[PDB]
Ligand binder design. Structure first.
Ligand SMILES: [K+]
Ligand SMILES: [K+]
Ligand SMILES: [K+]
Ligand SMILES: [K+]
Ligand SMILES: [K+]
Ligand SMILES: [K+]
Ligand SMILES: [K+]
Ligand SMILES: [K+]
Ligand SMILES: [K+]
Ligand SMILES: [K+]
Ligand SMILES: [Mg+2]
Ligand SMILES: [Mg+2]
Ligand SMILES: [Mg+2]
Ligand SMILES: [Mg+2]
Ligand SMILES: [Mg+2]
Ligand SMILES: [Mg+2]
Ligand SMILES: [Mg+2]
Ligand SMILES: [Mg+2]
Ligand SMILES: [Mg+2]
Ligand SMILES: [Mg+2]
Ligand SMILES: [Mg+2]
Ligand SMILES: [Mg+2]
Ligand SMILES: [Mg+2]
Ligand SMILES: [Mg+2]
Ligand SMILES: [Mg+2]
Ligand SMILES: [Mg+2]
Ligand SMILES: [Mg+2]
Ligand SMILES: [Mg+2]
Ligand SMILES: [Mg+2]
Ligand SMILES: [Mg+2]
Ligand SMILES: [Mg+2]
Ligand SMILES: [Mg+2]
Ligand SMILES: [Mg+2]
Ligand SMILES: [Mg+2]
Ligand SMILES: [Mg+2]
Ligand SMILES: [Mg+2]
Ligand SMILES: [Mg+2]
Ligand SMILES: [Mg+2]
Ligand SMILES: [Mg+2]
Ligand SMILES: [Mg+2]
Ligand SMILES: [Mg+2]
Ligand SMILES: [Mg+2]
Ligand SMILES: [Mg+2]
Ligand SMILES: [Mg+2]
Ligand SMILES: [Mg+2]
Lengths: 101, 97
RNA sequence: UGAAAUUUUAGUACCUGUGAAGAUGCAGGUUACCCGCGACAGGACGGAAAGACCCCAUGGAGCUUUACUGUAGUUUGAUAU
RNA sequence: GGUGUAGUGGUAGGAGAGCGUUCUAAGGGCGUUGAAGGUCGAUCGUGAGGACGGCUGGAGCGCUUAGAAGUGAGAAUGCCGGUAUGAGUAGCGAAAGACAGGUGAGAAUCCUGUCCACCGUAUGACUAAGGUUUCCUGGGGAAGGCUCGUCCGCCCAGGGUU
RNA sequence: GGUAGCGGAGAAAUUCCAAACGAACUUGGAGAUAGCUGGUUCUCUCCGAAAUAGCUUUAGGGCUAGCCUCGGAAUUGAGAA
RNA sequence: GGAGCUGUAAGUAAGCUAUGAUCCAGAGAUUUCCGAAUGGGGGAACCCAAUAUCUUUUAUAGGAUAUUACUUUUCAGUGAAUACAUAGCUGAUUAGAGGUAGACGCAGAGAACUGAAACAUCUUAGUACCUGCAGGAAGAGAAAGAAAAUUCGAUUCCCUGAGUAGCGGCGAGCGAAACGGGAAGAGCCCAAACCAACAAGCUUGUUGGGGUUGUAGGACUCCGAUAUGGUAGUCUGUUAGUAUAGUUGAAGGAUUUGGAAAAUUCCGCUAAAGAGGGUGAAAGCCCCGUAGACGAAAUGCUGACAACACCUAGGAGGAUCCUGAGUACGGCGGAACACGAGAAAUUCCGUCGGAAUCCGCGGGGACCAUCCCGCAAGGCUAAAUACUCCCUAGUGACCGAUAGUGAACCAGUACCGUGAGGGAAAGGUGAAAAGCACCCCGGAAGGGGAGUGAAAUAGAUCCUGAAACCGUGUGCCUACAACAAGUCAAAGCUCGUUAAUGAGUGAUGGCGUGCCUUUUGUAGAAUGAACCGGCGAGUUACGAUUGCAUGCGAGGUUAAGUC
């Protein structure tokens, strides 16, 4: 997948449009991704998860990975991805510039 | 079916037979041949190439109903006598294949 | 606590007559405040069941026989082994 | 297109004109500023039927021409599903229970106890088959139990056959 | 344990053979056949019958004619009163 | 291949992973027990053994592994009546079993309902069913032919011939073939005469050589080539491709609405890519992908190319020999041929009888003669043809949850039945569980607030949410009235529209016996319907005929098949 854990990322669609953030986890079998600060839903929680009030948590729901646009780590302008065989090894590469990742 | 009443086919008699050696000839009635240029040679090959006769069943027979107006070296399997008269009178020539 | 058969819709009287010939429903006349409860069972040609009596079908099935046509077996002969 | 004359009851049935549904091809256009469908309207057309609005709804659908059909339902003792009717009616499936206490949100119905009644060549004790977990313990009362139920051969978690 | 349907068993009744046995049940041929009953869905307009003859192992079925409808055609306009 | 992975299936735990995981593909290993089940048995998924080695135990008992079914083929050893021997027995070997694909095709056996308006011949139908053999296809197949042309040259299949010729209680119905056109194309072996070798007992069994045919052929007698082409073969190899994993694969950002933009507007970009799908709504430019370009270590498959292997000869004579025997044929009885004994050729089965062989034999629809064509009684043979349990890629003027498979959901399930067997129902929250923390009533369920959410009258009976049916309230009317329950007129009362000779209700009066079916005729005491909703009946293929329309016109038109 063109998205991978440890990647600063821009969002394309949603109420959290134009926000940035990194990848906390990725679900390829759903083609979804989780992003800190984005889609922070308010979950009425029970205390069976070591939360001795039950309470109301705020946690990041997944996001569909097609609503996402990666960032150049050297430009800030968000881009699309190509795959290139550099040094024999296959890596992601920016469009709009040849920067890796 | 007439409701059990004796049907029309059953109350009537069978008649005749079929001759397996029957010769059924393809007919050309002498008004066609005003087509072809005088003096030429008419044949089953010519008639087929023109499209007049498509089925040379047993052979071409020529018959005289219409008026002939040409000299023609016609040839076929059989001619009728009136056709012979008309052709030979116009000035043609009968042959037989 | 909780069914069923039945059920075209129904604010479902009586006499006489009419009428697919025996009417809760049509007519004419009469009687009858509205809604129920318990009982009965005259009617709704009540329900149940495409009448088992009858007739029809060029229907079916079983059965009988000196009906027809055949046949398994039984018997006689010829021939082969 | 108009004027006149004459006609326009209708079954079986024949003929001709259509409305509507689904889909397709093309054209064109309408939809989160809310499509279809649903529902109410006192609307238009000779009829089949067609619009426009109000509320619902939440994503696909109309209009023109032509075409292809699983093309139109009120009956088939029709099929499937739903809900009525009878009707809160019959029935609640042979027999004796009463009381005090207790448990409990709640008790004719469960538990403990005392009297009482029933069986007793059995309504008792073994046991083959068959059933195949219904046995025991601890909880439960959603459903089942022809009532109820704190209870059960029901449900749930564990165990049990040497 | 044995007898199985063109059959078995029958102290024999047409009796029993897994809750209807004059020939079980099931599957297939099979959407059997049905001159028989029931049903057959939107509209308008034009016209509009018959229930008769003859024949029929035919009589509540069918065929032809008769009666209806539609299209064409021609003919000294025959048709009706 | 390159980072999340431990299925459905949440959730908890424990853990794995660039030391390259999960995942994907090829090959190999393990593969319990039943089942052909096969050591013996048995009520399948259980039991009990024999022999050899090894193991446990002080030793038994116990345990593991291997082998042990029957039948066929060959070989060997023993060996009865019975002497020789054979049978039999034992041991080694060899190849069969059984189910699939509810489909296709050869053979055996073989119905009836039905139609003939009854019915027996006949038809349905050599169908269904059963059984056997199978193969990817099978079967048929290289003329004892088709014809009448002196001519075509192996089978099969499509068109056509043709619904013709014929068959037929001359009824109902049945129904060809050849010619012609095409698809595909291929022809080969053997016995026999004779020759060489072996053997017993000059013939006669085995091996090899030879030789396969009809303008007759071969053996045999003479003349030279040692050739020349082909192959319907081989895990002989190589080579190339292809199937089974895959990789890459261009182009957009902002305004309005809105919860969300893919919609709207703005200017752009791209296209060997505007196929399709998904993405918070309808996206050419977000994603998967598409066009296009690359790629296989390993196992298969296909086709070529070399090696091996197998076939492959020519000209005269016919002195003599051979050229498929209980065979062809005939009689009787039956079948199949379109052909129902009929004038009945042809083919086949049973039975009985019973030929010649090159001056020979069979056919040309009884049969004889002439002519022509062919040479049986021995075998094989690809291709075009039929079918799909299945695999891959897909397509639809096919279905869209009473439809489409019986089954979109753990369906051949639950359930019914002793059993064979029959046989259901049941889909949709939301973009995302964010699925209602917390509070109150209550035993709980279930409600009410709060809160998430765009929306909760989207909260598990979850999108929409009709009707029947059950209710609540409210405007008008109703307790001297009989009424297929409406219609027409109409007072009074109450509301105010798709604003137009308005809506609702309705005292009271006049007229008026439901709908369907079937009937001479039904309000019907003749039939059907409890009601609502869904489903549910003149269609298609091939032909014929009539009309309408078009094209062409005494010429109008192709079928099959190829691209
Ligand atoms: K009564
Ligand atoms: K009888
Ligand atoms: K309908
Ligand atoms: K009869
Ligand atoms: K073959
Ligand atoms: K798209
Ligand atoms: K014959
Ligand atoms: K009235
Ligand atoms: K026509
Ligand atoms: K024409
Ligand atoms: Mg008669
Ligand atoms: Mg009477
Ligand atoms: Mg009377
Ligand atoms: Mg009246
Ligand atoms: Mg009472
Ligand atoms: Mg009755
Ligand atoms: Mg009756
Ligand atoms: Mg009229
Ligand atoms: Mg009138
Ligand atoms: Mg639609
Ligand atoms: Mg229909
Ligand atoms: Mg109905
Ligand atoms: Mg009562
Ligand atoms: Mg009791
Ligand atoms: Mg006693
Ligand atoms: Mg107990
Ligand atoms: Mg109860
Ligand atoms: Mg208990
Ligand atoms: Mg008797
Ligand atoms: Mg049949
Ligand atoms: Mg065994
Ligand atoms: Mg019959
Ligand atoms: Mg044919
Ligand atoms: Mg791309
Ligand atoms: Mg969408
Ligand atoms: Mg755009
Ligand atoms: Mg012969
Ligand atoms: Mg014979
Ligand atoms: Mg279904
Ligand atoms: Mg639905
Ligand atoms: Mg009075
Ligand atoms: Mg009053
Ligand atoms: Mg009345
Ligand atoms: Mg009635
Ligand atoms: Mg009724």
């Amino acid at each position: 997948m063109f998205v991978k854990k440890g990647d600063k990322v821009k969002v394309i669609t949603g109420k959290d449009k134009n926000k940035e953030g990194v990848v906390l986890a990725a679900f390829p079998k759903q083609d979804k991704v989780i992003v800190e600060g984005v889609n922070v839903v308010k979950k009425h929680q029970k205390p069976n998860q070591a939360a001795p009030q039950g309470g109301i948590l705020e946690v990041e729901a997944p996001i569909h990975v097609s609503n996402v646009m990666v960032i150049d780590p050297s430009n800030g302008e968000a881009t699309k991805v190509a795959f290139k065989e550099v040094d024999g090894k296959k890596v992601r590469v920016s469009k709009k510039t040849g920067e890796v990742l | 079916f007439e409701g059990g009443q004796t049907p029309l086919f059953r109350r009537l008699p069978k008649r005749g037979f079929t001759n397996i050696n029957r010769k059924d000839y393809a007919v050309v009635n002498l008004d066609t041949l005003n087509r072809f240029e005088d003096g030429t040679e008419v044949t089953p090959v010519v008639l087929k190439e023109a499209g007049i006769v498509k089925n040379e069943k047993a052979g071409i027979k020529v018959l005289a109903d219409g008026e002939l107006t040409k000299k023609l070296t016609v040839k076929a399997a059989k001619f009728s006598k009136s056709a012979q008269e008309a052709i030979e009178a116009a000035g043609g020539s009968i042959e037989v294949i």
